[PDB]
Design goal:
This is Phototropin. Belongs to the protein kinase superfamily. AGC Ser/Thr protein kinase family. It is found in: Membrane. The PDB classes it as flavoprotein. By secondary structure, the chain is α+β, with helices and mostly antiparallel strands. It is built from 2 helices and 5 strands, in the order E-E-H-H-E-E-E. The protein has a single domain, classed as Beta-Lactamase (2-Layer Sandwich), CATH 3.30.450. 19% of the residues lie in helices and 37% in strands. It is globular. The protein binds flavin mononucleotide (FMN).
């Protein structure tokens, strides 16, 4: 099934995206110049459920995995439903270094 993939740097305080797959840029309409070095939340908009945004904010603080269903918006403003799974990548000393994300457009 079609999916996209990003990597966030958890050594920086606000988890900026440091790598994105070609499908991520193609699905959202943003280019690497507007994606790299930024937190993923720019994809959110009016109808994004803050209860689910909270679930990811908390899971990132606690360094746990998480899977939420988020209303996101393309660059041209049109919406799409984003099934998002965030996975923590730890160093051998237990510290979280990166977060990785699989995003599926589940608008069907
Ligand atoms: C975004 N994908 C995504 C991928 C990774 C690896 C991580 C760590 C986060 C996301 N987010 C969410 C965003 O970065 C942030 O974690 C949340 O908005 C909650 O934090 P705040 O401080 O804003 O309450 C993703 N958010 C999206 O909307 N779409 C994704 O694809």
């Amino acid at each position: 099934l079609r999916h996209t993939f990003v990597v966030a740097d958890a050594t920086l305080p606000d988890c900026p995206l440091v790598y994105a797959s070609e499908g991520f840029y193609a699905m959202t309409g943003y280019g690497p110049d507007e994606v790299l070095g930024h937190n993923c939340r720019f994809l959110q908009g009016e109808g994004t459920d803050p209860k689910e945004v909270q679930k990811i904010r908390d899971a990132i603080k606690k360094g746990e995995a998480c899977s939420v269903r988020l209303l996101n918006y393309r660059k041209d403003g049109t919406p799409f439903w984003n099934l998002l799974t965030v996975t923590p990548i730890k160093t051998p000393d237990g510290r979280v270094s990166k977060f990785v994300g699989v995003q599926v457009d589940v608008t069907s």
